Design a binder for this molecule. Sequence first.
Ligand SMILES: Cc1cc(C(F)(F)F)nc(Nc2ccccc2-c2nnn[nH]2)n1
Ligand SMILES: Cc1cc(C(F)(F)F)nc(Nc2ccccc2-c2nnn[nH]2)n1
Lengths: 50, 284, 338, 244
Amino acid sequence: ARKLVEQLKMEANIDRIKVSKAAADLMAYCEAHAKEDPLLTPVPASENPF
Amino acid sequence: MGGVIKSIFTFVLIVEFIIGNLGNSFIALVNCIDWVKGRKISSVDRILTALAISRISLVWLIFGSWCVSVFFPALFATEKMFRMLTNIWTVINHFSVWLATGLGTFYFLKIANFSNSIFLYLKWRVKKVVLVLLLVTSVFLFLNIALINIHINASINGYRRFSSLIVLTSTVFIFIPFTLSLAMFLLLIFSMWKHRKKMQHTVKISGHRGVKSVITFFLLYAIFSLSFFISVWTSERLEENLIILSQVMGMAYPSCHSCVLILGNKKLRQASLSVLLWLRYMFK
Amino acid sequence: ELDQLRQEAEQLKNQIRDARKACADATLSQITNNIDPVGRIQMRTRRTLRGHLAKIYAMHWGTDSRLLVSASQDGKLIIWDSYTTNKVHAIPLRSSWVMTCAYAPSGNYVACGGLDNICSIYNLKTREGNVRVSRELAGHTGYLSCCRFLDDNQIVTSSGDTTCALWDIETGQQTTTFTGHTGDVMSLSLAPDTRLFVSGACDASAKLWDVREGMCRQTFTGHESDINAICFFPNGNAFATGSDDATCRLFDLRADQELMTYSHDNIICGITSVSFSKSGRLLLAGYDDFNCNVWDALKADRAGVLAGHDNRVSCLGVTDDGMAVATGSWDSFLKIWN
Amino acid sequence: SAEDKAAVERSKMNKKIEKQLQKDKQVYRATHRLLLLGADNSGKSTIVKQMRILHGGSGGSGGTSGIFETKFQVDKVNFHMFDVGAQRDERRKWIQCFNDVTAIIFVVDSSDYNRLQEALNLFKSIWNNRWLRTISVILFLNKQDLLAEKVLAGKSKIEDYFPEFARYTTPEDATPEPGEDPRVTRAKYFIRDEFLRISTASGDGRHYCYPHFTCSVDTQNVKFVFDAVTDIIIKENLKDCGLF
Ligand SMILES: Cc1cc(C(F)(F)F)nc(Nc2ccccc2-c2nnn[nH]2)n1
Ligand SMILES: Cc1cc(C(F)(F)F)nc(Nc2ccccc2-c2nnn[nH]2)n1
C-alpha cells in the first residue's frame, strides 16, 4: 500500500484556489467567448456548409 | 322466383359491402394510427395498407355501380358508362389482385428456404423482386384493357347484354395471378412441413408455428375457388340476370379476404381483440 | 501487519475525505444560480452517413473538423468527408469486434482495436493507393476498450486487463504501463496539453495519470456502477464520466471532488458516450434508450435532445471548431447534428 | 468542380468504394455469427475441432489473444464462430458486442461435477442478460461418454449435491439411444431439465433453448448448429412478417 499512500500524500500537497474564484473565472471566460460560439448565438445565413 | 332471388342477392351484396368496408377501413386505420404514433411500420404493414386502400376503392366503385343501376337506371343502360365503369373496374381490380400476389410473393421469399440458387437470389433480392413484379405486370393490365375495349366495341358495332364473354375474359385474366399465388402457398406449405419433419427427427421436441394461421387461408382459397368454378358454369349454363350476380360475385374476394388477413396477421389479430375488449369495457 | 496496513489505509482515506469536505464551501449550482439558462437547444440532422453494414461502435473526428472515422462490428473502418457526405476510405479490419478507433491529430494515421486485444495502426499517407497496417501493437491482456494518439509516434490505450499503457508506434514497445483500477477500463481522454489522461473503469472509479511520470495523481469513486464513458473539459481542469447509473458527474482536478451531478428521474437507462461542446457550457451524452440528451454542464438540466436513431447511440463527438456533432448508433447510421 | 469529382481520389472514387460495400453487405448477411460460451472444464476447445472441416489451419489462441474467430460451413451456408479468448470474468462488459449474434452456443461438461451448479448459475446469468433477451441459446451437454462411464460404474454422486434427483424421474419426452441404462438416461435428462427449468421460467417466446447431448468425438455438432439456426432464422422471418 506504499504506492497508494505516496499518491495520496502527493495529491494532498497541492495549492487549491477558492471555488468562487474558479466560478468567476469560468463565467468570465464564457462571457468573453459568448459571441464567438456558433451554437449559443445562431449566425444569420453564415453556415457556409450546414 | 325472380323477386326472391333478387332480394337475397341484394341482401348478400349489402352485407358483403359493409363487412368489406369495415374490415379494410380497420386495417388502414390501425396501420395509419401505428404510423402516426411512432411504431416504425414493417414492409408487410405497408403492403397490407396499400391492399386495404385498393380494396376500399374497389368496393366503393362496385357499390356506386350498384347505386347507379338502382337509382335512375337509364344512365346505367348507356354504352358510355358500360365502357368507362368496366375500364376503371378492371384497372383497379388488376392492381389490387397483383398487389395481393406481391404480398404472397413477399411471404414466400421472406419466410421459406430452398437449396436452389435461383431461389436464394430471389430470397435476398426480395424487396426489388416484388416491386419489379408489380411494375412488370402492367403489360397484363394494358393487354386486358385493349382486349376488353375491342371486344365491347365489336359487340356495340354488331348491336348497331353480351356480358357472357366479357365475364369469361375477366375470369381468365383473374385466374392467372391466382394460380401463381396458389402454387406459391402450396410450395411454402411443402417447405414448412419438410422443415418440421426434419426438425422432429434429429432435434428433440423441447427445441415454425405459422401453420396455426394456414387454416384460415386454406378455408379462404377453398371458398373463393368454388365460387369462381360456379361462376364460369353460370356464365353460359342458365338464366340471364347476370348483372346482379356478377356485381355480387366480384366483391367477395376484397370483402372477405381482408378478414382472413386480420386473423392471419399477429398485429391485426391483437388490434381486433383490443377493439373487442374496449367495446366490452365501454359497456357499463 | 495486514491489520496495521488496513488501519493506515482507512486513516488516509478519512483524511482525504475530511480535506475534500473542508475544501467544499459553496456548491457550483448555488454559485451559478444567477446566470441565465441556455434555453432549449434544437438540433437538426444536417447529414446522414449510410454504408456501414452493422452496429457502429466508435467514431472520431479528424482535426480539420471535416474528415471523420467510424468503426462497426462488421469490421469496416470508414473515413467520411462530412461536408460532402462521401467515403474517402473504407479500411477493412483484421478483427470484426472493433470496440474503438482514433484519428491522428495530423491525419496521417488511424488506430482501432477491440476483442482481439491488438491495437492496429493504419497509415493513410502512403505511396501506394491502398491503406496498410503501419504497426500492430500487442501486449495488452483482455479487450482494447479505448485508444488515442498523443502524436504521430505515441499512442495511449486502455483495456480489460484493468491497465492503461503508452505505446511507442515506431518501436512497438510499451513506454509506460498505468495500473491501479480493479475493474476493466472502458474509456480515455487526453488533457489538451497532452500531458495527462483520465480513465474510468468497471469498479466505478476514475483515475488521473501523469504521462511523463507513469503514476496516479487523483482518484474518484463518485459513481456506484461501472463507468463506460469519460471526456475532458476544454479547459482541461475537469472531466465528466458516464455510467450505467443514468448519472453524469463533473469532477474538478484542482478541487479533487465532485462539483455537480446530471441526472433525471425519467432516465432509467445507462450512458454509452459523453462529450463537451467547444465552450464547455453544453454537454452531450448518448443513452441506451435510443437517443442522445444534451445538457447544460454549468446547470444540471436536459436542455435538448438529438433523436432519430432506431437503436442505441453507441458513440458521439463534437468537431474541434464546434461546427458539428456526430452520433453513431447500433442502427448503422451516423447523423450530423448542427 | 474538377478537384471534387475526379476518378482517382475524389467523389467518383468515393462512388467506387460503394461497389465494395454493396459486395460486402452480401457476405455479412449470408454468414451466421455464433458466440461460444461455457466453463473452463467444458470441452468447447474440442468442439471447435469437430466444427472444422477446413484443410488449412486457423489461428486461434496465441499468447494474450482475445478472441478465437473460427470458420466452418454446412450445405454451403457459412458460419463464423467466436470463442472469447484471453478476457477477464467481468463478462457483463464484453457480452454487449454479441447483441447481434444468430445464437449463443453454451457448452457444459455434463459429467456429474459439483461445478455443474456454477454452469447452472452462468446459464441463469446469460439466459436473462439484458443484451441477450432476443438471442437464442443452443445448449451442449458435452462429455456424456464420461457421464455414461461414471453412472454405469456406479461412482456417480448426483443426489449427494443435487438433492432432488432421487425424487425426479425420467420424462415421456425422453428418447434414449439403443442400450442406454435407466440410470444414465435419468441422469442425462435430469441435467437437461435443470437447464430447461431456467430457460422456460423467463423464455416467453423472444428466445428459445436448444438442448443437445454430445461427446468428445461426435461428427454431428455441425449439423446440430445448422438445424438449430434454421429453426431460429425461420422464427425470426415469421416475426419480421408479423405472422407469428
Ligand atoms: C397472412 C399469411 C400468413 C401465412 C402463414 F400462415 F404462413 F403465416 N400464409 C399466408 N399465405 C401465403 C403464404 C405464402 C405465399 C403466399 C401466401 C398468400 N396467398 N394469398 N394470400 N397469402 N398468409
Ligand atoms: C359492379 C360492377 C358493375 C359493372 C358495370 F359497369 F358493368 F355495371 N361492372 C363490373 N365489373 C365486373 C366485375 C366482375 C364480373 C363482371 C363485371 C362486369 N359487369 N359488366 N361488365 N363487366 N362490376
